Structure formats: C-alpha cells, structure tokens
Amino acid sequence: NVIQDLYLRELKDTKLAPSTLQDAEGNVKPWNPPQKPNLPELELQGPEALKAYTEQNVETAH
Amino acid sequence: PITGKVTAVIGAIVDVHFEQSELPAILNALEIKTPQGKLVLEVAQHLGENTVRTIAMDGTEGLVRGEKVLDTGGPISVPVGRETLGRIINVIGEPIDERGPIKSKLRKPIHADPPSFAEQSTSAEILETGIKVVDLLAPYARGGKIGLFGGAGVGKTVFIQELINNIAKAHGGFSVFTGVGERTREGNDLYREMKETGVINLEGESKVALVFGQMNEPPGARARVALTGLTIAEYFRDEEGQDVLLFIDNIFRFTQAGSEVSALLGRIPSAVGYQPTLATDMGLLQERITTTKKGSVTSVQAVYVPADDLTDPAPATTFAHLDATTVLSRGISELGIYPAVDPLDSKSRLLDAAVVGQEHYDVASKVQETLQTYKSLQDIIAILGMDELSEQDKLTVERARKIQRFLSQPFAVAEVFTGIPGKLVRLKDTVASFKAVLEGKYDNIPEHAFYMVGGIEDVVAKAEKLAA
Amino acid sequence: VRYEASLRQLEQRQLAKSVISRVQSELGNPKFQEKVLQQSISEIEQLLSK
Amino acid sequence: AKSAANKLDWAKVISSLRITGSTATQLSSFKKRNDEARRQLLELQSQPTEVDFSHY
Amino acid sequence: EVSSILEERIKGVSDEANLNETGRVLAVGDGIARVFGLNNIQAEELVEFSSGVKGMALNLEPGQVGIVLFGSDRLVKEGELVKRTGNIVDVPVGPGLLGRVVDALGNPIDGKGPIDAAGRSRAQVKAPGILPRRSVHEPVQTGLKAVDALVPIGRGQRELIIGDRQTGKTAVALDTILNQKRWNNGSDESKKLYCVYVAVGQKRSTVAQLVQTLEQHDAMKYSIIVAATASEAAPLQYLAPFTAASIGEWFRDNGKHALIVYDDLSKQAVAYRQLSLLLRRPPGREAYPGDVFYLHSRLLERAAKLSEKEGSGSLTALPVIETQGGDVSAYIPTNVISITDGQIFLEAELFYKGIRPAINVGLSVSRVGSAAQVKALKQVAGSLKLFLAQYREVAAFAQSDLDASTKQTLVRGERLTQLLKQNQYSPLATEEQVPLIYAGVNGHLDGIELSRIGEFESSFLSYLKSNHNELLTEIREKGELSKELLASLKSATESFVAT
C-alpha cells in the first residue's frame, strides 16, 4: 500500500528513544534494603525477677 | 463552510438543514451563535435530505428559523486539567464560577467509550476512608459505585464533605461534585459552605472541582451534565493516574432527565414512563466508572427513590449497577450518632470474607451479630426490664451499647459544625478498635467516655480523663 | 513489570500519532497526484478483472 | 514442645479442677499460648524467602 | 517489538478487494438506518457499514431496507455506504473457543489469542425435532446437596433458576461450573461437559472479576465465556444468547455433552424490549413486546438431549431469571416458567436468614429431574423431598400445640435444613453426598444436637474416609446401594454417631 511505504519510512525515520531512568523510578520505587530490626527485647532477664517470683508466688488456693 | 439553517424549533428539538456532503455525524455538537451567547445542539438523528434533528442544551426561546449554525464536529469538548480544580463549570463547559476562562490544557468529548474488558482491573481493592462505620461494615472500594441513601441536609452534604477531607488524606486526590438537578438555592449554600470548609480554596488548593447543573437548565442539558462530570474525572484517572471520587446528586433526576429526552425524541416510552434506552444510557454512565490500570474513579451517587418503591424501574436499574449502599438514617442521627449511618441498614458487597480477610470479616460479623441481637432484644428488654436480661443477654446489651457509642466519631469537616474535633481513623486502626471491643478489654468504661471518640487506643486516654 | 508494560503502551500511542503525522504529510504531496494515477491504472486492472 | 505445652496445659487444667494449682499459672499458660499461636501463623506466614528470577 | 507488531498489522492489511455492491444510508438515528439499494440483500443478512460496524437487515421493504445497527450509533451517519457481508448472521463456532472470552460477533474481548474456530454458524437455527430427541439419562451434579437430590438435574435438560437480584445469583450456577471438574478435569470425555457461561447485561468490571475467579479455579481451560456486558449495545445483547447457543450446538452436534448457562435472560428481555420500542412495534404487556414469548421460546428450545442417532448430543440449559422486586408472577418470569422445565426458586428471606446460598425447595420443581439421578442418590434421598415438604407443613402450623410425633418431625426437619446448608464455592463430590443424606434420612441428626450439625458433617466425612473409603469407592463405582452397602452404611453411620 501507499500506507505500507509510508509506515516503513515513518518507523525508520522516527525512532522513539527510551524513557529516562528517573521517570521509570518515579513510577517504581527502587530496591529494598535488608530489614535489619536487629536485637528484639530481652526475655525474662535475670533471676532478680525469679527471686521476686519465688517469694511472691505461694498464692495457690485449695 | 459547514453551515446550516434552522428549519424547525418545535420545543427544544431543533432540526437543522445543512448544505449537502458536509453533514454532521450522530452525537456531534453544533453551535448557534446567539445574542444569548451560543446554543449548543447535539445531533441525535439524521432526517435525510441534508437535514438532521438535533436537541438543544440551552434555552431555545426567541430562535428564528434560518439562523446559520456551525458544527463543532463532535460531542461537546469540555476543558479538563488540574486548572479545573476548584472551578464551577457549567455543562456547556464554561466557567460559572466567574473566575474567568479556565486555563484549558486539553478538552475532551463528553462521550467517551467505557474502558476495555482487557483493561479492567481483575480484582477489587478497598478504598480507605476515615469513617470507622464505613470501614467496618461497608468498606469503600476503588473503582466502585457506592450509592448513598438516606436523609438530605441532615448532615448529608457534610457527609459528602467529610469524604472530600478524607480523600485528601487517603490519596491526596481530587473530587468532582457533580450536581444534576440541583436547586440553585441549595447550590449557593454548597459553594459557600465548601469554600468555608476549605475543600475549595479559591486562593489555593482545591480537591473538589464543582459542576453544578440547575433544574432550570433544559432537560437535555440536565441529561448531559453527568457525562461532562465524568470527563473531568477521566482526566484525573487516565492522565493524572489519580484515584478520585465523583459525587452525583439525584440519579433519579438523571433518569428523569433521560426519560424526557426520549419522549422529546418521540420514542415510545418504556414501562413506568422511563426511556426505552433506560438501560443503555445508565449503562454508559456507570461503565465509564471503574478501576483502570492508570487510576480509578469511584462514584458516590444519591438515589432518590420515587415513592420509596424499590420495585420501581428507576431504582431497580440503579441497584443493579451499585456495589454497596450506605443507608444514612435520621433515627440513628437522633440517637446522637454522627456518622448518621444506620449500620444494620447499610449493606455492602465490598464487605466479603475473602475481600477484607477473614479476621476483618469475623470482627465485622460479630459486630453485626451483637448489634443485630441487641436491637431486637432491646425492643422487649426496654418494656420487660433489664432484670429480665440473662447474664448472656446483658453481656450482649452491654457490648452492643459500648459499640453503639463507639461507632460515632466526629468528622473533620464538622469540627466547626458540631464544635467537636474531627476523627479520621485509619482502616488498620479501625479493625483494631473493634477487635478490642469484641474482646471487651476496655469494655467497662463509661458509655459517654465512648461517645464521639476515635479508635480504641485513642479512647483509652479519653476514658481516663472523661471518667476523671 | 507494570511500568514496562505501560511503557509499551505509551510507545505504541506515541508511534501511532507519528503515523498520523506522516499521513497528513503524504496526502499534501503530488503523491496525491501520482498515487491517484496508481489507483487509476489499478482500477483499470480491477475493472478488467470483471 | 508445643504439643507438650498443650497436653500438660490441659492436664494442669484438670489437675487444678481438683486441687487448684492455677491462680497465676494459667496466666503463664495464656502467655505461652499467645506466642505459640503466633508461631503457627508465623510458619504459615512464610513464603519463599528469595526473589524469583527464573520466570520473573 | 511495538514496531514489529505494527509492521505485522500493516503487512496483514495489504492488498485491495473486489467490491461489487453497496447501498447508501438515507436516514439514521434511533439505532436503525434506512439504506437505499441493496436489492440483492438476503433476509437477516449481515451488512458491514462504511463506519465498519455490522448490522442485521430487519425490514426488507420495497424502497428501503432497514438495517439494525449492532451497536455504535456515533460512527454511523447519513450517506454512508453499506456493503453486504453476503452471509446470514453467523458467529465463529469451534473447539478453540475454549478458554476465550468473546463478544457477540466473536471478537475476543479478553483479547487472549486470535479466534480458533472450526466453522461459523447461523445465529438462528432450527431446534431438534421430536424425532431426533431422546430423553435424559445422565446426571449433572452441582455439589449442592439440596440441588442434587431435592431438585435433581440431568443432562440436556432445561432447568430454570429464578430468584431475586444480586444475591450472588450467579454464584449458584458458578458452583455447578466449578463442580464440573470431576468430569471436566475428569478424564472421561463421555462424561465431559463443555460449559458456556453467557454473561448478558452485567457490569464489565464484575464480569472481569468473575473471569479472574474462573481462572483462579483454573476452570477457564474447560469452559467458554460469551460476554455481552451492560455497556455493550442492546442489539448485540439481543443477538447474544442466540449466538451463544450456536457455539454450544457445535459441541452438541459432535455428540459431546455440554452445558450452557444463560445469565440473565431477564436482561435479554430488557434488551429485546428496547429494540422493539426503538423499532416502534406496539408495546406489549408491561411494555415488554408482544413477540417476547417467541424470543425466549425459540432460544430455549434449541437445547436438548439428542438421540442415539444424533450421537446422544446434550446441551444442558440453565436460564437464570432475575425476578424484579421478587415478583414471581411477573409477566416475563411466568412466560419463562411455562417454557422451562422445572424452576429453582431461591428465597430472599432465607438468604438473609442465614444460608448463602439459600435454595428454597418449596418453590423448586424439576419436571423430569429424578430420572437422571444416580440410583444411590435416589435410594438414600428417598422421600426426603416429601419429608421436607412435611417439615414445610410442620413449621407452617408450629406457630400452637405440638404432638410428640410433630416434635420429632420438627427436630428432624430443622436439623435436616441445617445439613442442606453450604457456603459459596465449596462443592461436594457425588460420592460424598450419598452418606450425608443417608444419615439424615436414617434420622441420625436427631442424634446430633442442632449446634453440632456442622461438626457432624465434616467429621462424618473425615470419619467415613478413614473408617473405610472402600465403601465410598463402592458407591462411586456401583452408584447404587446393595443390601450389603445399605447395612455397611447403617453400621458405619452408627459407628460415627457414637464417636
């Protein structure tokens, strides 16, 4: 077609250059770094608690 | 050039004879220069013999048969943009805010084919809202059409305003309050009030864009107001990617406007008067609202059921399109609950076990069950006495009444209006609020200490000060 | 992946309007004359094929 | 173990059923139950811990 | 990429064509056009407009031909050239339509691949005569117990499903489609149904969710979807069931078993109404045109269990009627009811009142359904329909003195009702349904307090498989209960009841 000729020419002579990396970034937040919340809270730390608990706990009903 | 002479003006139905081989096409827009301004006519037929039959969108009075008309070439193209934010624009796409020519970016035809089946969003999403009542029992959804039912001016307008405030937090989007068949008196109030609650700042940020469509406007132009508003929304959705929310006024008056246009077009009326093209016309309006890849419109509609007959075709067609219904009630508002929303009456299809997850669902179901049993129980419990409550029964009565006060939370927009600081509580925190109340962790706290409060965490503090 | 698919669509519509632009350019030319001649002889061939 | 924890928990419930052995023991049982119930949903919460790059 | 595909499209539209006739439009609007010429037009031909849309010639008059525009009014305009397609309205039909959503013309609106179709076939075709018909004899199982014995359904059988708007109306049918995977994903091709889901007048978004649901249950690969959404134009909707039924017939006329769900014919009524009114034919009752009866009847009777001569074809029809305002005497519904064989009325009160879905069995009939049922599911379920229409009576007059006999019936009835209940998208195997019904019939749900009925069901099934899945395998293959099987089940049920 006259179209076929037109297209071929058009396509060749008009090349879209790919979008900037920043614009891609704008629509997609990049990477995810290691979660790293590190150490969580201490678990039942020291026998200080234990001494308190041994003494406190005696409250057992019949 | 493309010109034609007016060859009839029977009613607002103007037949225009155009010179041969230059003829319009169906749904094109013709403009008659007038000392009244312009008359925009929309071609709805070809009568042959180089004549068409068009309908008018402006008053046809004083027209002289033989005025030259000029053809726009296609459906009315209204300016759209970020400039349209906070501008009152009439249906013929011209500023009626009297802040002068809106700085047009692009303009777009009012008729715009609904998004492709391929580009449909394959699964639903939940549009977050601040309102806890909404967020539990009828959670808003992206894309969806959620049709408000209830009172009017009872805070109805304010409920809509609340949503605008929330929308700014929720996304930061825009809105378009489209009013079809809007009393010009009511419109004045809406504009001044909307300015006052700052959702419109004429000197600044405006989320809501206003399109006001008075009842005095021709029935055809009343019909086209809706399509115009939708076009504004599509610029937001498609071309700003935004999720936006478009309010419509009476969709009864949408139907009413349409029925008339059919009758004017001389078509045989379909059952209960409504247009024979009732289904298709509504279909176009409510399928141009959806979640596309780009964005999603979401539409809040007002359904003014005629004769309160849900059997009536105009409601029936609406109910087919609707996904959820929010049922504001004045009885509930009279219980002092603001939200006005009657929780049991509201029903949603966006509240589903899969959709909101099992936990949210289970919490909701329990909250429904507690309230449902409570209301029925309270009927004869009130008569019989609270002493005729079992331990199980008074547990529910207690739990329910704690929920009942807890449901109410002030609105940011109505911070001024009630006087009480607004509460906008995030969706995650809403689930949390009800979970705790279900586990009755803080249920032992006064009813007034749960009255008009935010989330559970918030009301732990308020409970201490209120009690003290 | 979403932005990639979106970019293919964006590319397609940009390149679509470039075709339209080239169409508007060709029909101005005396290709408007010469391809009408092509149609004329083609119509001769077609009409002879009946 | 968790199966140990629950068998002994309910055993202590039926021991406390006779001579009460729970007062604040059951509050300990409640705490271990809480996090134990967290672990099963944790183990169910797990999905592949590495990004897909064969297909994806 | 995008360049190559575009270049491919151009290469694929190269070369001229030999056009031989046209007519020219004179007057158009109200979605009908009046064309001048086309004297060679066949009746009900498909014409292609200059705009590119297609229409079906309806009124052939001596001076005008009146095309009916199959959507798109905007693009059509006066003095356009209408060229004859030359063919009566046909739609591509074939095996390859499996796993393709298509619109009415046959354009894949999911856009998944190009059409793979054996033939194209005219939209209206004569129904199977009396002589090529042979009565039903194979069951269709929906995995809903109430349906599968109290409202029995076979193959090649028309069987209306009627009830109130958006009660997930679609879900009742959907469950049948899903359940059919124990024969559809089941190997036996002498048991393969090929099921067509026609979505007419439904939200395009909702349909896309449905499609996604079907693709989630990996069911798309055994099914065809025809779609004529709410957005899609009313004349397309008019031709939409008819075209779908043509697609079904290709399977049927291979002798293969198939099923078609026409959801919702109530929206077809509104469409034909629109079309008729815009053709200004005299408004019929309730403004539904006077030829509406013919429209439904011609559609409905084109499905059927063919005879052995025809290779025992079957096309099981399930037409889904949306009672407006729950009016069960409405003109369109009553007209449909008379055409259809059996109806499956669903009750709104029960739906709200704790069954989702809630299949009312009082107003559900199936005219010849019971003859297609598996003998096991006749034996175990013997008279349970009667029993629960004694329960219906019992609770009618319960609200009053109750005899111990009445109380026994009430206790059985209420508890049986609990047993019927099932939740959406959770189907039950044919084998599995047999013992559960055996239990209830044999009154073992008097043995289970009302609260624990749900526990009984799941536990009983787990128990049965663990105790002896050998029995269930026997009921699976034998499909009938011998005296030994009856005793074995009695013994087994008693065994589970104890634990």
Q: How far is CA E25 from CA B49, E32, E85, E87, in A?
A: 11, 10, 16, 20
Q: How far is CA B374 from CA B362, B388, E352, in A?
A: 18, 14, 18
**Least Cα separation, residue A61 to chain D (angstroms):** 6
Provide the 3-class DSSP secondary structure of residue B250: strand
**E166 known member of a binding site:** yes
* Chain E interface disruption, residue of B270, B290, B305, most E CBs within 10 A: B270
Label residue E96 left, alpha or beta by phi (over 0 means left) and psi (-120 to 50 means alpha): alpha
* Chain A interface disruption, residue of C9, C18, C41, most A CBs within 10 A: C18
Q: What phi, psi does B7 have (nearest 5°)? A: -120, 5
Residue B116 and residue B110: Cα distance in Å, rounded?
17
| Residue D20 to residue A62, Cβ atoms within 8 A | yes
B-contacting residues of E 177-236, CB under 8 Å? 201, 203-205, 207-209, 211-212, 227, 229-231, 233-234
**E473 known member of a binding site:** no
Count of residues making up chain A: 62
Give B267's DSSP letter: P
**Least Cα separation, residue A33 to chain C (angstroms):** 20
CB of B93 within 8 A of CB of B77?
yes
Indicate the CATH number for domain E374-499.
1.20.150.20
Give B34's DSSP letter: E
Residue B333 and residue E182: Cα distance in Å, rounded?
53
Strand partners, E199: E227, E263
Residue A39 and residue A36: Cα distance in Å, rounded?
9
| Environment class of E328 (CB within 10 Å of its CB; exposed 0-12, middle 13-18, buried 19+) | middle
The strand pair at B13-18 and B3-10 is best described as antiparallel
Q: Which helix (H) or strand (E) holds B386?
A: none
Residue C20 and residue A41: Cα distance in Å, rounded?
66
Query: Where do the domains of chain E lie?
Result: 15-87, 88-373, 374-499
CB of E178 within 8 A of CB of E163?
no
Give E149's DSSP letter: I
Give 3-state DSSP helix, strand, coil % of chain B, rounded to 5.
Answer: 35, 20, 45
Residue B370 and residue B373: Cα distance in Å, rounded?
5
Residues of C with CB under 8 A from a CB of A: 2-3, 6-7, 11, 14-15, 18-19, 22-23, 26, 31, 35, 38
Q: How many CB atoms lie within 10 A of CB D41?
A: 9
Give E12's DSSP letter: T
**E168 known member of a binding site:** yes
Label residue E94 left, alpha or beta by phi (over 0 means left) and psi (-120 to 50 means alpha): left
Select from B235, B85, B93 the least CA-distant residue to B164. B85
Put simply, whether E1 touches C (Cβ < 8 Å) is yes
A·C CB contacts under 8 A: 30
Put simply, whether E16 touches C (Cβ < 8 Å) is yes
Tell me if the domain spanning B1-75 has CATH number 2.40.10.170.
yes
Residue B56 and residue C50: Cα distance in Å, rounded?
50
Sheet holding B245-250, edge to edge: B88-89, B208-214, B175-182, B245-250, B299-302, B145-149, B324-327
CB of E30 within 8 A of CB of B265?
yes
Q: Which amino acid is at E43?
A: A
Q: Which amino acid is at E135?
A: S
Indicate the CATH number for domain B351-468.
1.10.1140.10
CB of E55 within 8 A of CB of E75?
no
Q: Report resolution (Å) to 1 decimal.
A: 4.5
Put simply, whether A53 touches E (Cβ < 8 Å) is no
Of all residues in chain E, the one with the smallest CA distance to A12 is E3
End-to-end alpha-carbon separation of chain D, Å? 39
Q: What phi, psi does B288 have (nearest 5°)? A: -95, 5
Residues of E in contact with B21 (CB under 8 A): 79
| Residue C12 to residue E18, Cβ atoms within 8 A | no
- Select the residue of E7, E11, E15 nearest A11 (Cβ to Cβ): E7
Residues of A in contact with E3 (CB under 8 A): 11
| Environment class of E24 (CB within 10 Å of its CB; exposed 0-12, middle 13-18, buried 19+) | middle
Select from E426, E438, E435, E499 the least CA-distant residue to E471. E435
Q: How far is CA B155 from CA B151, B158, E223, in A?
A: 8, 5, 50
| Residue A10 to residue C11, Cβ atoms within 8 A | no
**B226 known member of a binding site:** no
**B150 known member of a binding site:** yes
Q: At what angle do helices E234-252 and E265-278 cross, to 10 degrees?
A: 130
Q: How far is CA E9 from CA B32, E3, E100, in A?
A: 43, 10, 22
Q: Which helix (H) or strand (E) holds B109?
A: strand B106-109
| Residue C11 to residue A16, Cβ atoms within 8 A | yes
Residue B155 and residue B171: Cα distance in Å, rounded?
24
DSSP per residue over E157-200, as a string? -B-EEEEETTSSHHHHHHHHHHHTTSSSSSS-TTS---EEEEEE
For chain E, the chains sharing at least 3 beta-carbon pairs closer than 8 angstroms are: A, B, C
Strand partners, B31: B40, B70
Indicate the CATH number for domain B76-350.
3.40.50.300
Q: Considering the candidates E367, E412, E415, E476, report the single residue annotated as catalytic.
A: E367
Q: How far is CA B78 from CA A32, B108, B442, in A?
A: 43, 6, 55
**B11 known member of a binding site:** no
In our burial notation (b when 16+ CB lie closer than 10 A, e otherwise), range B56-71 reads bbbebeebeeebebeb
Q: Which amino acid is at B379?
A: D
**E280 known member of a binding site:** no
Residue E447 and residue E460: Cα distance in Å, rounded?
13
B·E CB contacts under 8 A: 134
Rounded to the nearest 10 degrees, how much is the dihedral formed by the CA atoms of E367, E372, E376, E377? Answer: -40
Put simply, whether A54 touches C (Cβ < 8 Å) is no
The strand pair at E23-29 and B141-142 is best described as unpaired
Residue E378 and residue E383: Cα distance in Å, rounded?
9
Count of residues making up chain C: 50
Residues of C in contact with A28 (CB under 8 A): 2-3
Q: How far is CA B201 from CA B166, B188, B245, E80, E234, in A?
A: 16, 16, 18, 51, 44
Of all residues in chain C, the one with the smallest CA distance to A23 is C3
Give E72's DSSP letter: -
Tell me if the domain spanning E88-373 has CATH number 3.40.50.300.
yes
Select from B238, E8, E2, C25 the least CA-distant residue to A16. E2
Q: Which helix (H) or strand (E) holds E228?
A: strand E223-228
CB of E37 within 8 A of CB of E47?
no
Strand partners, E133: E306
Q: Residue B442: how many CA atoms within 13 Å on its side-chain side?
A: 23
Strand partners, B299: B145, B246
Of all residues in chain A, the one with the smallest CA distance to C31 is A2
> What is the SS3 assignment for A1-62?
CHHHHHHHHHHHHCCCCCCCHHHHHHCCCCCCCCCCCCCCCCCCCCCHHHHHHHHHCCCCCC
Of all residues in chain D, the one with the smallest CA distance to A58 is D23
CB of B290 within 8 A of CB of B112?
no
**Least Cα separation, residue B153 to chain E (angstroms):** 29
In our burial notation (b when 16+ CB lie closer than 10 A, e otherwise), range B280-300 reads bbbbbbbbbbbbbbbbbbbbb
Active site residues of B: 156, 182-183
Query: Where do the domains of chain B lie?
Result: 1-75, 76-350, 351-468
Residues of C in contact with A10 (CB under 8 A): 18-19, 22
Q: What was the structure determination method?
A: cryo-EM
Omega cis (within 30) before B339: yes
Q: Which helix (H) or strand (E) holds B171?
A: none
With touching defined as 3 or more inter-chain CB pairs under 8 Å, the answer for chains C and E is yes
| Environment class of B87 (CB within 10 Å of its CB; exposed 0-12, middle 13-18, buried 19+) | buried
Provide the 3-class DSSP secondary structure of residue E68: strand
Token readout for B385 is 């006495």
Q: Which helix (H) or strand (E) holds E377?
A: helix E376-379
DSSP per residue over C13-50, as a string? HHHHHHHHHHHHHHTTSTHHHHHHHHHHHHHHHHHHT-
Residue E155 and residue E138: Cα distance in Å, rounded?
6
Q: What phi, psi does B396 have (nearest 5°)? A: -70, -40
Rounded to the nearest 10 degrees, how much is the dihedral formed by the CA atoms of B163, B168, B174, B178? Answer: 20
In our burial notation (b when 16+ CB lie closer than 10 A, e otherwise), range E195-205 reads bbbbbbbbbbb
Q: What phi, psi does E92 have (nearest 5°)? A: -60, 140
DSSP per residue over B191-248, as a string? HHHHHHTTSS-TTS--SEEEEEEETTS-HHHHHHHHHHHHHHHHHHHHHH--B-EEEE
Residue E265 and residue E21: Cα distance in Å, rounded?
38
Angle in degrees, CA B298, B413, B147, rounded to 5: 30
| Residue E231 to residue B277, Cβ atoms within 8 A | no
Token readout for E451 is 């609260």
Residue E238 and residue E275: Cα distance in Å, rounded?
8
| Residue B270 to residue E273, Cβ atoms within 8 A | yes
Select from B106, B102, B86 the least CA-distant residue to B94. B102
**E64 known member of a binding site:** no
Of all residues in chain E, the one with the smallest CA distance to B48 is E27
Residues of C with CB under 8 A from a CB of E: 8, 11-12, 15, 42, 46, 49-50
Residues of D in contact with A61 (CB under 8 A): 20, 23
Strand partners, E258: E315
Token readout for B97 is 């805010």
Residues of E in contact with C50 (CB under 8 A): 18
CB of E492 within 8 A of CB of E442?
no
**Least Cα separation, residue C19 to chain A (angstroms):** 7
| CA B327 from centroid of its chain's CA atoms | 13
Q: How many CB atoms lie within 10 A of CB E92?
A: 21
* Sign of the Cα pseudo-torsion (D16, D19, D24, D25, in order): negative
End-to-end alpha-carbon separation of chain E, Å? 66
Could you identify the residue written with the tokens 């009016």? E327
Residue E146 and residue E358: Cα distance in Å, rounded?
10
Could you identify the residue written with the tokens 């009301």? B459
DSSP per residue over E28-63, as a string? EETTEEEEEE-TTPPTTEEEEESSS-EEEEEEEETT
CB of B443 within 8 A of CB of B401?
no
A·E CB contacts under 8 A: 15
DSSP per residue over E255-305, as a string? T-EEEEEEETHHHHHHHHHHHHHHTTPPP-GGG--TTHHHHHHHHHTT---
Cβ neighbors of E464 (< 8 A, separation 6 or more) are: E435, E471, E472, E492, E496
| Residue C42 to residue E16, Cβ atoms within 8 A | yes
Considering the domain delimited by E15-87, tell me its CATH architecture. Beta Barrel (2.40)
Put simply, whether E14 touches C (Cβ < 8 Å) is no
Residues of D in contact with A59 (CB under 8 A): 23-24
Select from E189, E128, E122 the least CA-distant residue to E158. E128
| Environment class of E483 (CB within 10 Å of its CB; exposed 0-12, middle 13-18, buried 19+) | exposed
Radius of gyration of chain B (CA): 25
Strand partners, E196: E224, E260
E-contacting residues of A 16-35, CB under 8 Å? none
End-to-end alpha-carbon separation of chain A, Å? 101
Q: Which helix (H) or strand (E) holds E216?
A: helix E204-216
